[PDB]
Design a protein around this ligand. Structure first.
Ligand code: CLA
Ligand code: CLA
Ligand code: CLA
Ligand code: CLA
Ligand code: CLA
Ligand code: CLA
Ligand code: CLA
Ligand SMILES: CCCCCCCCCCCCCCCC(=O)OC[C@H](COP(=O)(O)OC[C@@H](O)CO)OC(=O)CCCCCCCCCCCCCCC
Ligand SMILES: CCCCCCCCCCCCCCCC(=O)OC[C@H](COP(=O)(O)OC[C@@H](O)CO)OC(=O)CCCCCCCCCCCCCCC
Ligand SMILES: CC1=C[C@H](O)CC(C)(C)[C@H]1/C=C/C(C)=C/C=C/C(C)=C/C=C/C=C(C)/C=C/C=C(C)/C=C/C1=C(C)C[C@H](O)CC1(C)C
Ligand SMILES: CC1=C(C/C=C(\C)CCC[C@H](C)CCC[C@H](C)CCCC(C)C)C(=O)c2ccccc2C1=O
Ligand code: SF4
Lengths: 241, 41, 86, 87, 157, 741
C-alpha cells in the first residue's frame, strides 16, 4: 500500500496529530465529506465494503453525532450543579450537588427531595423517551414518515431532511443558523469537535468520581491548589476512600 | 399462520403433545383417585 | 518514587526498545525478519500506516515497542528486587 | 562418523563441551548443578556397587543434568546441520 | 535438504521403504552377519550357532521364575526345562520343514540390492532345512547344558 | 487482505414455510416419506451441512448460528440450575452446617408414592441429594443468599435470549462472509487474550473483591446472614483492609512495581485450607492473575492489520526437516477450509482437557467442603472422564470424515499427511503389536494371579508379598513432588496436593486428602489403562488412516464415510468404513473409561476416604485394594459384589430410584444386544409377515415400514449399549457413595 500521498495530504492540512494515526485503508473511504472527518479509523469500522447490521457508515456517523449531543448535555449537567453550589447560588452543599449523588446511583448517594421517587420518574422517562426515540428511529428508517400521521399538529415539523443527524426543520432549526452550505459544514465541525470533547470529559468525570470520590469542580480546584501532589499518580494510594 | 399450524400438525409435535396430554390426564386421575388397584364401581 | 532505581530501570528499559526499532535495530511494523528471525528484511509498506516521523516510525511501532519494553522492564525489576539487588 | 550415517558431526562437540560451561554456574543454593551432581556421583557410591537408594538427591540431579545435556545436544545438532536454519 | 527416507532399492512401487533403521550401514552389517543371512555357510553350522544362543538364553527365565525357584535344585530343574523347550521348538522346526519343503517349482531368481544375481539360500530346501534343524538340536541342547555349567562356575553370578 | 468485518444483509427470510416441509434441507429427502427409512434419514442428516450445500460460506454461517443456539441452550440449563438452587434447595441452611447437611436442590411432587425420594438431607428440608457440586462452587464465589442465585438465574435467562437472538440475527439479518471466518490469526488473538485472558482477569477481580472477604469470614466463623454484602467489600477499602491490610495502600504498590506488598492476598502457599479442605483462595487468585497476564501476552503473536505479528502459514511452512520432506506445508489450507479437521483437533484436545480436569480436581479440591463430599468428588471425576472419552472418540470420527471428504491429494504432496498416509501399514502393524504385548503383560498377570490363588500358591502371584511389581518411576516422581517445597520451589510453603505425601488433611472428622501409596496393584491397573487406551487409539487411527483406501478395497473413499459394507465378496467386507471403526472405538472407549472409574472408586474408598478417630484413619473399605486388586476375583467380589449391596437394598428408601435405574439400565444394555447380534434381512422378513397381517385388515400404512439400515442398526446397538452400561455404573456409584459417604 504505502498510503496514497495525495490522500494523506488532506489529513495533513487538518493539522495537529491527525496524520500519525491515519492509514491507507481508512483514507479509501474517508475523503472529508462528513464533518469532523480527520482520517482516524485504525480499526476500519466505517469501511463501506461488507457493511451491514449496525456497523455501517451511515449508522456509525449518526450514532457519533447522537453521542456528541448527549455527551455535551451530560458534561454541562455534570458541571452546572457543582459550580452553582460551590458559589452558594443554590441551597445545596458542594458535596451534595455532585452528579453521581443526585439519585442515578442510590448506593453512591441520592437526593431524596424530588417531587416523586426516582423509580416513578424513570417510568415517566421511559414512556417519554420511548416516544421520542421511536419516532426518531422510524424517521431514520423512512425519512418521509413521521410527518404524515397526525400527532397533535406537531408532525408538521417532523419532515426532517436527507441526513438523519441533521433534521433542522421548523423546530430543530428555529433560528435558521447556518444558511449557506459552507457555514453549515463549519458549524457541524464545531458541533462534532465539541461533542467529542464532551464525551472525553464525561468519561473523565466518571473516572475521577470513582477514584477521588468528589466532584469534577472540586477535583479541578484541588489540582490547581497543588498540582504536583493532587493528580493521577498522587491519588493511587487512595482510590475509593 | 397456516404454515405454523401445519408445523404443529407434524408427527413429532403431535406425538409429544398427545403423550403429554395423556400423561397429564393419567397423573391427575392418580392424584384425585390414588391407589386404584381394582375397578371398584 | 520518581528518580529512584526502579524508575530509572523502567524508563530506560522502555525507551531503549523504542530507539532500537526506530534506527533499524529491532523489528517494527515495516521491517520484519525472515524465517531465521535474526536478519531484518528491508522496510515494506504494505500495511498502509502513516506517520510524520522521517524514518516512518508509526504509532503501532510505539505501542508494540513500548509494550515489549514494559514487559522486559517489569521482569527485570521484579527479578532484581526478588533476588536481593535493587 | 566412522560407522552408521549418524548426522552427529564431529565439529558438533561444542554441545557436550559447552553445556558444562553453563551448568557449572552456581545457582545460589548449594554450590552448582554440575558440582552437586558430581559430588553425589563420587559420594553416594560410584554409581555401580550398591545403589542410589529410592528417590535421592542424586536421582533428581542426574535427571536434570542429563535432561539439559540431551536437549542441548539435539537442539545444537539440528541447528548446526540446518545451516543458519535454512529449512 | 537430505532425505533419509527413500523407496526400497529406488523402486517406489514395492511395499517397503528404506529408513535409517533398515538401511543403516552398521545395522545392515550386523543384520547381514547373522547366521540366518549366510547364503554361503552350511545350514548345519548356522543352526548350531542359533541353537546354542537360543538354548543358553532360555535357561534364565525358568531359573529365576520357575515354580521351584526358591529351592537349591532350581538350576538342574531349569536345565531340564530348557532342554524340553529346545526339543519342542525342534519338532516345530521339523514340522515346518516337512510342510514347507515338499515340492519343487521354477521360482524366480534372487538378486542383491545392486543387481548382482545370487543363488537361493540353500537353507530354503528340503535337505537344507533338515541339516539346519539337526544343528539346532545339538546346539540347543548344548546351550542349555552350558547354561547349567555357567551357574556352577562364574565366580560373580 | 486486511482483517475486517464483512457481512451480507438479509440472506434468509424469517418465516415458517420450511417448518411445515420436513426434509427441505436435503435434496434426497424430496421424494417424500415413501418408506420409514426417510424418517430416520431426516434426523441422521439434519446437522450434516456439508451435504445440504456445496458452499463453504453457507456451511460456516450454519455452524455459527448453531453455536449461538447451543450457547442459548447452555444458558437455559444454567438458569435452571441457579433457579432450583434458589427455590428448591437448602443452600442457605447448608452454609451454616456444610459438614453435616447434605446438599439438595430437587424436590419431587407426591403423585404415586414417589415422595419417598425426598430424603432428609438436613436443615428442615426434604429433597433429592445432588452431586453436581454447585453448593461448593457458590460458596467459593460467596453467594451466601438465595436472592443472588435468583438474580443469576434471571441473568442467565436474559443471556439465553441474547444468544438465540444473536443466532437468528447472524443467520437471517447480518450473516458473516467466508473471508470473515477464515481469519484464524484474528480469531486466535481474540480467543487467547480477549477471551481466556480477559475472563481470567475478570474472575481474579471478582475473587479479590468478593470471594476473599466473604470466604475469609466464613472460614473464621461468622453467620452467613451477618457477613457484609459483596458491594460493601468491593467499594470499601477500609473494611477490606480490615480483612487484608495490604489494601490500605491502594493501587500504588501495583504501579510502583512493589508487588510484594500484595503478598497477603496473592500468596503461593500450596496444599489445602485446613478449615474447608480446599485450595487457598488467595493462591487461586494469584493463579488466575498470572494465567491472565500470560494469555493476554500470548494474544499478541499473530499478525492482523499491522506489520507486527507472526503468520501461521509462515511458521507452519518453516518447520520441515530431513525426515519429513516438505513438512507442515498445506496444513494451513486444510485448517482454514475444512471444518471437520478443526473439529477433530478441538475435540481431541477438549476431551483430553476434560480428563486432565477430572484428575486435577480430585487431586487438589478447589472448592471448600468439596473433598469431604465423597459423592460430589466421585460424581465429578466420573462425569468428566466420560465427557473426555466421548470427545476423543468424536475427534477420531471427524478426522476420518475429513480424510474422506475434504482430503485433496493435489494439495498434500510429500507433506506430513502424505508421508503418514504412505506408511500407514508400519504404524498400524506396530500399534497392533504393542496392543497385543500390553494385553498379554497386563491381563495375563491378573489371570496368572487368579490361577495361583485358586491353586493354593499365593507365593507365586504378582503381589506386594510375592513377586513384587513396584512402580519405582511413579513413586520417585511422587516423592520428588513431595520434596519440592523449599528446594525446587523455595517460595512454596507446601506441595500442590497432599497425595504426593505428608500429613493427612481431614475436615469435620472425614479425610479430605492424604498421601496415595502406589504398589503392585497400581502398577497392574496402570498397565491395564495403557493397554485399553492403546487399543482404542489403534481402532480410531486405523479407521482414519484406511478411510480412503485399503488393500482389500482400493476405492473405499468413493463409497463414502458411512456405508455398511461392500458385499459378501472377498470373504466379507462388513464394517469396513471409517464410521464402523468409530462404532467399535466407542465400545473400547467405554471399556477403558469403565476400568478407569472403577480403579478410582476402589482406590479412594480403600486408601483415601475415611474417618479420623484420633487413633488413625478408618477407610470405607478398610484398604482391601492393596491385597485384592491383583486378581479378577477380587474385583468381582471385593468391589462389584461387596459395594453393590447399597444399590440392591435401596428399595423402600430415598435411594430407591438408584435401585430402579440400576435395573432399568441393565435392561437397556441387554436390549442393545438385540441390535448388535442381528441382521437386517431377518427383521425385514418378519416385518413382511406383520405387513401381511396389516393388509389383511386394511390397516397397512402408505409409509412402507422398513427395518433399520445396517448402519442405523449398529448405531442403535452402540447407543443402547453405552447408555445401559454408563447408567448402571452411575446408579451403582451414586447409591454406594450416598449410602456410605
Ligand atoms: C459471542 C460471539 C459473537 C461474535 C463472534 C460476534 C461477531 C460480530 N457481531 Mg455480534 N452479537 C453477539 C455475539 C457475537 N457477535 C450476541 C450474543 C449478540 C446479542 C446481544 C450480538 C448482537 C450483534 C448485533 C446487533 C450486531 C452484531 C454485529 C457483529 C459483527 C460486528 C461486531 C463488531 O465487531 O463491532 C463492534 C463490537 C462492539 C461495539 C461491541 C461493544 C459493545 C459490547 C456490549 C461490549 C461488551 C462486551 C463484553 C464481553 C462485556 C464485558 C462485561 C463488562 C462489565 C466489561 C461481528 C462479525 C454487528 C454486525 O452485524 O456487523 C455487520 C451488529 O449490528 N452482533
Ligand atoms: C456547542 C455545541 C453544538 C454546536 C456547535 C451545534 C451546532 C449545530 N446544531 Mg446542535 N445540538 C447540541 C449542540 C451543538 N449543536 C446539543 C447538546 C444538542 C442536544 C439537545 C443538539 C441538538 C441539535 C438538533 C436536534 C439539531 C441541531 C442542529 C445543529 C446545526 C444547526 C445550526 C445551529 O443551530 O448552530 C448551533 C448554535 C450554537 C451551538 C450556539 C448556541 C450556544 C448556546 C449556549 C445555546 C443556548 C440555547 C438556548 C436553549 C436558547 C433557548 C431560546 C432560543 C430558542 C432563542 C448546527 C451545525 C440542527 C441541524 O442539524 O440543522 C440542520 C438540528 O436538527 N442540534
Ligand atoms: C535482571 C534480570 C533478571 C533477574 C536477575 C531475574 C531473576 C529471577 N527471576 Mg526473572 N525475568 C526476567 C529477568 C530477570 N529475572 C525477564 C526479562 C523476564 C521476562 C519479562 C523474566 C521473567 C520471569 C518469570 C516468569 C519468573 C522469573 C523468576 C525469577 C526468579 C527465579 C528464577 C528461577 O529460578 O526460575 C525457576 C527455575 C526453574 C528451573 C523452573 C523451570 C520450570 C518451568 C516451570 C518449566 C515449564 C516448562 C513448560 C513447557 C513451560 C529470580 C530471582 C521466577 C520467579 O519466581 O519470580 C520471582 C518466575 O516466575 N522471571
Ligand atoms: C421464530 C424464529 C425463526 C424462524 C421463523 C426461523 C425460520 C427458518 N430458519 Mg432459523 N434460526 C433461528 C430462528 C428462526 N428461524 C434462531 C434463533 C437461530 C439460531 C439458533 C436460527 C438458525 C438457523 C440456521 C443455521 C438455519 C435456519 C434455517 C431456517 C429456515 C428453515 C429451517 C427450519 O426452520 O426448520 C425447522 C426447525 C425447527 C422446527 C426447530 C429446530 C430444532 C431446535 C432448534 C432444537 C432445539 C433443541 C431442543 C432443546 C431439544 C433438544 C433436547 C430434546 C431432545 C429434549 C426457516 C425459514 C435453515 C435454513 O436457512 O435453511 C437452509 C438454516 O440452516 N435457522
Ligand atoms: C474479545 C473478542 C471475542 C470474544 C470474547 C469471543 C468469544 C467467543 N467466541 Mg468469538 N470471535 C472473535 C472474537 C471474540 N470472540 C473474532 C474477532 C472473530 C472473527 C475472527 C470470532 C469468531 C468466532 C467464531 C466463528 C466463533 C466464535 C465463538 C465464540 C464463543 C466460544 C464459546 C466459548 O467456549 O466461550 C464461552 C461462552 C461464553 C463466555 C458466553 C458469554 C458470551 C459473552 C456475551 C461474550 C461475547 C463476546 C462478543 C465478541 C462481544 C461482541 C458482540 C457484540 C457485537 C454484541 C465465545 C463466547 C464460537 C461460538 O460459539 O459462536 C458463538 C464460534 O463459532 N468466535
Ligand atoms: C477486571 C478485574 C478487576 C476489576 C474490575 C477491578 C476493580 C476494582 N479494583 Mg482491583 N485488582 C484486580 C482486578 C480488578 N479490579 C487484580 C487482578 C488485582 C491484583 C493486582 C487488583 C488489586 C486491587 C487493589 C489493591 C485495589 C483494587 C481496587 C479496585 C476498585 C477501584 C479500582 C479502580 O481502578 O476502579 C475500577 C477499575 C476499572 C473500571 C478498570 C477500567 C480500566 C481503565 C483504567 C479505564 C478505561 C480505560 C481508559 C478509558 C483508557 C475497583 C472496583 C481498589 C479498591 O478500592 O479496593 C476495593 C484497591 O485498593 N484492586
Ligand atoms: C462439538 C461436537 C460434535 C459436533 C458439532 C458434531 C457434528 C456432526 N457429527 Mg459427530 N461426533 C461427536 C461430536 C460432534 N459431532 C462425538 C463426541 C462423537 C463420538 C460419539 C461423534 C461421532 C459421530 C459419528 C459416527 C457421525 C457423526 C456425524 C456428524 C455430522 C452429522 C450429525 C448429525 O446430524 O447426525 C444426527 C444427530 C442425531 C441423530 C442426534 C441423536 C442423539 C443421540 C443418537 C441420542 C443420545 C441420547 C442422549 C445422550 C440422551 C439420552 C436420553 C434418551 C433416553 C432420551 C455433524 C457435522 C455423522 C456424519 O456423517 O458426519 C458427517 C456420523 O455418522 N459424529
Ligand atoms: C483502550 C482504551 C483507550 C482508548 C484509546 C482509543 C481512542 C483513540 C483516541 C486517540 C486520539 C486520536 C488522534 C487524535 C489526534 C489529535 O491529537 O488531534 C489534535 C488535538 C485536537 O486538536 P484539533 O482537532 O483542533 O486539531 C486541529 C488543529 O490542531 C490544527 O493544527 O490537539 C491536540 O494536540 C490535543 C491532544 C493532546 C493530548 C491530550 C493529553 C494531555 C495529557 C498530558 C499528560 C502529561 C503526562 C502524562 C503522564 C501519564
Ligand atoms: C514413554 C514416552 C511416551 C511416548 C511414547 C513413545 C512411543 C512412541 C514410539 C513411536 C516412534 C515413531 C518414530 C517416528 C519417526 C519420525 O517421526 O520421524 C523422525 C522425526 C521427524 O523429524 P524432522 O527432522 O522431520 O523434523 C521436522 C518437523 O518439524 C516436521 O515433522 O523426528 C523425530 O525423531 C521424532 C521423534 C520420534 C521419537 C519420539 C520419542 C521421544 C522420546 C520421549 C521420551 C519421554 C520420556 C523420557 C523423558 C525423560
Ligand atoms: C474513533 C475510533 C476509531 C477506531 O478505529 C475504533 C475506535 C478505537 C473504537 C474509535 C474510538 C472510539 C472512542 C474513543 C469511543 C469513546 C466514546 C466515549 C467516551 C463516549 C462517551 C459518551 C458519553 C456520554 C454519551 C455521556 C452522557 C452523559 C449523560 C447523559 C449524563 C446524564 C446525567 C446528568 C447530566 C447529571 C445527572 O446527575 C446524572 C445523569 C443522569 C447520568
Ligand atoms: C429389533 C431390530 C430391528 C427392528 C426395529 C425397528 C423396526 C425399530 C422399531 C421402532 C418403532 C417403530 C418405534 C418404537 C418407539 C419406542 C417406544 C421408543 C423408541 C425410541 C425412539 C423415540 C427413538 C431392526 O430393524 C434391526 C436392524 C438391524 C440390526 C438389528 C435390528 C433389530 O434388532
Ligand atoms: S452381512 Fe450385512 S454388512 Fe456383512 S457383507 Fe452382508 S450385507 Fe454387508
Amino acid at each position: 500500500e504505502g498510503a496514497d500521498l495525495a490522500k494523506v495530504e488532506r489529513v495533513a492540512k487538518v493539522g495537529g496529530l491527525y496524520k500519525n494515526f491515519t492509514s491507507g485503508q481508512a483514507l479509501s473511504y474517508l475523503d472529508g465529506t462528513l464533518p469532523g472527518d480527520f482520517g482516524f479509523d485504525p480499526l476500519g469500522l466505517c469501511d463501506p465494503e461488507g457493511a451491514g447490521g449496525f456497523i455501517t457508515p451511515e449508522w456509525l456517523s449518526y450514532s457519533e453525532v447522537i453521542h456528541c449531543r448527549w455527551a455535551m448535555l451530560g458534561a454541562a449537567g455534570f458541571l452546572a450543579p457543582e459550580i452553582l453550589a460551590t458559589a452558594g447560588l443554590i441551597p445545596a452543599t458542594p458535596e451534595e450537588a455532585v452528579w453521581f449523588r443526585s439519585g442515578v446511583i442510590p448506593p453512591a448517594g441520592q437526593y431524596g427531595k424530588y417531587w416523586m421517587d426516582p423509580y416513578s420518574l424513570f417510568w415517566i422517562e421511559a414512556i417519554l423517551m420511548n416516544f421520542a426515540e421511536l419516532k426518531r428511529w422510524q424517521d431514520f428508517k423512512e425519512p418521509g414518515s413521521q410527518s404524515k400521521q397526525y400527532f397533535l399538529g406537531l408532525e408538521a415539523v417532523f419532515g426532517g431532511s436527507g441526513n438523519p443527524a441533521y433534521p433542522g426543520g421548523q423546530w430543530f432549526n428555529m433560528l435558521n443558523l447556518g444558511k449557506t452550505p459552507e457555514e453549515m459544514k463549519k458549524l457541524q465541525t464545531n458541533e462534532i469537535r465539541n461533542g467529542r470533547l464532551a464525551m472525553i470529559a464525561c468519561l473523565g468525570c466518571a473516572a475521577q468520581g470513582v477514584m477521588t470520590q468528589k466532584g469534577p469542580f472540586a477535583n479541578l480546584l484541588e489540582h490547581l491548589a497543588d498540582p504536583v501532589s493532587n493528580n493521577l499518580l498522587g491519588n493511587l494510594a487512595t482510590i475509593l476512600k | 399462520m397456516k404454515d405454523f399450524t401445519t408445523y404443529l400438525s407434524t408427527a413429532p409435535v403431535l406425538t409429544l403433545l398427545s403423550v403429554t396430554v395423556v400423561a397429564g390426564l393419567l397423573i391427575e386421575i392418580n392424584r384425585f383417585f390414588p391407589d386404584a388397584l381394582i375397578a371398584a364401581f | 518514587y520518581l528518580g529512584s532505581t526502579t524508575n530509572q530501570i523502567m524508563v530506560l528499559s522502555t525507551f531503549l526498545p523504542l530507539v532500537a526499532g526506530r534506527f533499524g535495530l529491532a523489528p517494527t511494523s515495516t521491517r520484519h525478519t525472515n524465517q531465521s528471525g535474526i536478519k531484518l528484511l528491508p522496510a515494506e509498506k504494505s500495511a498502509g500506516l502513516v506517520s510524520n516521523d522521517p524514518a516512518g516510525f508509526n504509532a503501532v511501532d510505539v505501542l508494540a515497542l513500548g509494550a515489549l519494553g514494559h514487559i522486559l522492564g517489569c521482569g527485570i525489576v521484579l527479578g532484581l528486587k526478588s533476588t536481593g539487588n535493587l | 562418523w566412522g560407522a552408521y550415517e549418524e548426522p552427529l558431526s564431529l565439529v558438533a562437540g561444542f554441545l557436550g563441551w559447552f553445556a558444562p560451561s553453563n551448568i557449572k554456574v552456581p545457582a545460589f543454593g548449594n554450590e552448582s548443578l554440575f558440582g552437586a551432581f558430581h559430588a553425589s556421583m563420587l559420594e553416594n557410591l560410584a554409581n555401580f556397587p550398591q545403589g542410589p537408594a529410592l528417590t535421592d538427591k542424586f536421582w533428581i540431579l542426574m535427571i536434570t543434568w542429563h535432561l539439559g545435556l540431551f536437549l542441548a545436544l539435539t537442539l545444537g545438532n539440528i541447528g548446526q546441520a540446518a545451516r543458519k536454519q535454512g529449512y | 535438504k537430505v532425505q533419509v527416507v527413500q523407496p526400497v532399492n529406488g523402486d517406489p512401487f514395492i511395499g517397503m521403504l528404506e529408513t535409517p533403521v533398515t538401511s543403516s550401514p552398521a545395522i545392515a552389517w550386523y543384520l547381514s552377519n547373522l547366521p540366518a543371512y549366510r547364503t554361503g555357510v552350511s545350514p548345519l553350522l548356522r543352526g548350531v550357532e542359533i541353537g546354542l544362543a537360543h538354548g543358553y538364553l532360555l535357561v534364565g527365565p525358568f531359573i529365576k521364575l520357575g515354580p521351584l525357584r526358591d529351592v537349591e535344585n532350581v538350576a538342574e530343574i531349569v536345565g531340564c526345562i530348557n532342554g524340553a523347550a529346545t526339543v519342542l521348538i525342534l519338532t516345530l522346526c521339523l514340522a515346518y520343514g516337512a510342510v514347507t519343503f515338499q515340492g519343487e517349482g521354477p521360482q524366480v531368481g534372487v538378486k542383491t540390492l545392486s543387481g548382482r544375481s545370487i543363488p537361493r539360500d540353500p537353507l530354503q530346501s528340503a535337505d537344507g532345512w533338515n541339516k539346519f534343524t539337526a544343528g539346532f538340536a545339538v546346539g540347543g541342547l548344548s546351550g542349555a547344558a552350558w547354561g547349567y555349567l555357567c551357574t556352577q562356575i562364574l565366580p560373580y553370578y | 487482505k486486511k482483517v475486517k468485518i464483512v457481512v451480507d444483509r438479509n440472506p434468509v427470510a424469517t418465516n415458517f414455510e420450511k417448518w411445515a416441509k420436513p426434509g427441505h434441507f436435503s435434496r434426497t429427502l424430496s421424494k417424500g416419506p415413501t418408506t420409514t427409512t426417510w424418517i430416520w434419514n431426516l434426523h441422521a442428516d439434519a446437522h450434516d451441512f456439508d451435504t445440504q450445500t456445496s458452499d463453504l460460506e453457507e456451511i460456516s454461517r450454519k455452524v455459527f448460528s448453531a453455536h449461538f443456539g447451543q450457547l442459548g441452550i447452555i444458558f437455559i440449563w444454567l438458569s435452571g440450575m441457579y433457579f432450583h438452587g434458589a427455590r428448591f434447595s437448602n443452600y442457605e441452611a447448608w452454609l451454616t452446617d456444610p459438614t453435616h447437611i447434605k446438599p439438595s436442590a430437587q424436590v419431587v411432587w407426591p403423585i404415586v408414592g414417589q415422595e419417598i425420594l425426598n430424603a432428609d438431607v438436613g436443615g428442615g428440608f426434604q429433597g433429592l441429594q445432588i452431586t453436581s457440586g454447585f453448593f461448593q462452587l457458590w460458596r467459593a464465589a460467596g453467594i451466601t443468599s438465595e436472592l443472588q442465585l435468583y438474580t443469576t438465574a434471571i441473568g442467565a435467562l436474559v443471556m439465553a435470549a441474547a444468544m438465540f437472538f444473536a443466532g437468528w440475527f447472524h443467520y437471517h439479518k447480518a450473516a458473516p462472509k467466508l473471508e470473515w471466518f477464515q481469519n484464524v490469526e484474528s480469531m486466535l488473538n481474540h480467543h487467547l487474550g480477549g477471551l481466556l485472558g480477559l475472563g481470567s482477569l475478570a474472575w481474579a477481580g471478582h475473587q479479590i473483591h468478593v470471594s476473599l472477604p466473604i470466604n475469609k469470614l466464613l472460614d473464621a466463623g461468622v453467620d452467613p446472614k451477618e457477613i457484609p454484602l459483596p458491594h460493601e467489600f468491593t467499594l470499601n477499602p477500609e473494611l477490606m483492609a480490615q480483612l487484608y491490610p495490604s489494601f490500605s495502600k491502594g493501587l500504588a504498590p501495583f504501579f510502583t512495581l512493589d508487588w510484594a506488598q500484595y503478598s497477603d492476598f496473592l500468596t503461593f502457599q500450596g496444599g489445602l485450607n485446613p478449615v474447608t479442605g480446599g485450595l487457598w483462595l488467595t493462591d487461586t487468585v494469584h493463579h488466575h492473575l498470572a494465567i491472565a497476564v500470560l494469555f493476554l501476552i500470548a494474544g499478541h503473536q499473530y499478525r492482523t492489520n499491522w506489520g507486527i505479528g507472526s503468520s501461521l502459514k509462515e511458521i507452519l511452512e518453516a518447520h520441515k526437516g530431513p525426515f519429513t520432506g516438505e513438512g507442515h506445508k498445506g496444513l494451513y489450507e486444510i485448517l482454514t477450509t475444512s471444518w471437520h479437521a478443526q473439529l477433530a483437533i478441538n475435540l481431541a484436545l477438549f476431551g483430553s482437557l476434560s480428563i486432565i480436569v477430572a484428575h486435577h480436581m480430585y487431586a487438589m479440591p478447589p472448592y471448600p467442603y468439596l473433598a469431604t463430599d465423597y459423592g460430589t468428588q466421585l460424581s465429578l471425576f466420573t462425569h468428566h472422564m466420560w465427557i473426555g472419552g466421548f470427545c476423543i472418540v468424536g475427534a477420531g470420527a471427524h478426522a476420518a470424515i475429513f480424510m474422506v471428504r475434504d482430503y485433496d491429494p493435489t494439495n498434500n504432496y510429500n507433506n506430513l499427511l502424505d508421508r503418514v498416509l504412505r506408511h500407514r501399514d508400519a504404524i498400524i502393524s506396530h500399534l497392533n503389536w504393542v496392543c497385543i504385548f500390553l494385553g498379554f503383560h497386563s491381563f495375563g498377570l491378573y489371570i496368572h494371579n487368579d490361577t495361583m490363588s485358586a491353586l493354593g500358591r499365593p507365593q507365586d502371584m504378582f503381589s506386594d508379598t510375592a513377586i513384587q511389581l513396584q512402580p519405582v518411576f511413579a513413586q520417585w516422581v511422587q516423592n520428588t513432588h513431595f520434596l519440592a517445597p523449599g528446594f525446587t520451589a523455595p517460595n512454596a510453603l507446601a506441595s500442590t496436593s497432599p497425595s504426593w505425601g505428608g500429613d493427612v488433611v481431614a475436615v469435620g472428622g472425614k479425610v479430605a486428602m492424604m498421601p496415595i501409596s502406589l504398589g503392585t496393584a497400581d502398577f497392574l491397573v496402570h498397565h491395564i489403562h495403557a493397554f485399553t487406551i492403546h487399543v482404542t487409539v489403534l481402532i480410531l487411527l486405523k479407521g482414519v488412516l484406511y478411510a480412503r483406501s485399503s488393500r482389500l478395497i482400493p476405492d473405499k473413499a468413493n463409497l463414502g464415510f458411512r456405508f455398511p459394507c461392500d458385499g459378501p465378496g472377498r470373504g466379507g467386507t462388513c464394517q469396513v468404513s471409517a464410521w464402523d471403526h468409530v462404532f467399535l472405538g466407542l465400545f473400547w472407549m467405554y471399556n477403558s473409561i469403565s476400568i478407569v472409574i472403577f480403579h478410582f472408586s476402589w482406590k479412594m474408598q480403600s486408601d483415601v476416604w475415611g474417618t479420623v478417630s484420633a487413633n488413625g484413619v478408618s477407610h470405607i473399605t478398610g484398604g482391601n485394594f492393596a491385597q485384592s486388586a491383583n486378581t479378577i476375583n477380587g474385583w468381582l467380589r471385593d468391589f462389584l459384589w461387596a459395594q453393590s449391596s447399597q444399590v440392591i437394598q435401596s428399595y423402600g428408601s430415598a435411594l430407591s430410584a438408584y435401585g430402579l435405574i440400576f435395573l432399568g439400565a441393565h435392561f437397556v444394555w441387554a436390549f442393545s444386544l438385540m441390535f448388535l447380534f442381528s441382521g437386517r434381512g431377518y427383521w425385514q422378513e418378519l416385518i413382511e409377515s406383520i405387513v401381511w397381517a396389516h393388509n389383511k385388515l386394511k390397516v397397512a400404512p402408505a409409509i412402507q415400514p422398513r427395518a433399520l439400515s445396517i448402519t442405523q442398526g449398529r448405531a442403535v446397538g452402540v447407543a443402547h449399549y453405552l447408555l445401559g452400561g454408563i447408567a448402571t455404573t452411575w446408579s451403582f456409584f451414586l447409591a454406594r457413595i450416598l449410602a456410605v459417604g
